[PDB]
């Protein structure tokens, strides 16, 4: 079997992508953030503390004829930006884009942190990293990908993220109409539980390609592209009004500038991010300063190929017993 779902940016800046998921019988449709950097499917629910719920849509397990409580199981997660949630665990039927898995662990939030409450467009998260990162205790639960792999026509999913526009997540097949050229595959290390790979180098604008290993993760759930400080310094040295701003927390530039492209290597292949993709947008409505889409990973401790990189490519997550990552231009 296969599935296909449209994913849409939550705002005009492409801060995050949401994809509708059907939970339960009859189906309750929630808009989840598909996150390749974690492995929990968690949702706002009838169990979430009422003063921490805004205008999110909630899962009510009691209204689902297929929900079963997972007795004694709890979970607890914090993310790279400090946000957090915790709760207990049901199994239920979960469908994305026509692809149905039964007995999927659906983690019911009893509490969420303030950033979650404030973001009305995100109803929860669907984690797509390796199931080693799942936070359910005492026994970890498999991700929607892992539970699906048995019935998938091929053990794969693709990310096709749009620049200011909807895109697609597909499970179980590769849509050859959706990119140009051929896909280049590169090895994944699962040692840390991420889609972790090694980029072969990079170039700024029309200058030279520098072969230097960049170990990074491909993360649909991070907005920006975070690279080592000396790589990021080399890009913005090509932008005359760009500086590092302590107050705003990164590289900013006049919204006026035309930014150079950035190229990253995947084996022998090159993926080119258009300069416009790296123009995040004004630091405030009406400002003449804009925020950069390429920032230092020095403070995070890991390089992150986030949405700014991924949306310039067609991305194949190959979840075979030895997994790989494929990149094609589109």
From Swiss-Prot:
Disulfide bonds join 255-290. Its EC number is 3.4.23.22. Keywords: Aspartyl protease, Disulfide bond, Hydrolase, Protease, Signal, Zymogen. Residues 17-328 form the Peptidase A1 domain. Coiled coil: none annotated. The active site is at residues 35, 199. It catalyses: Hydrolysis of proteins with specificity similar to that of pepsin A, prefers hydrophobic residues at P1 and P1', but does not cleave 14-Ala-|-Leu-15 in the B chain of insulin or Z-Glu-Tyr. Clots milk. Belongs to the peptidase A1 family. This is Endothiapepsin. It comes from Cryphonectria parasitica. The gene is EAPA. The chain holds residues 90 to 419 of 419 of the full protein.
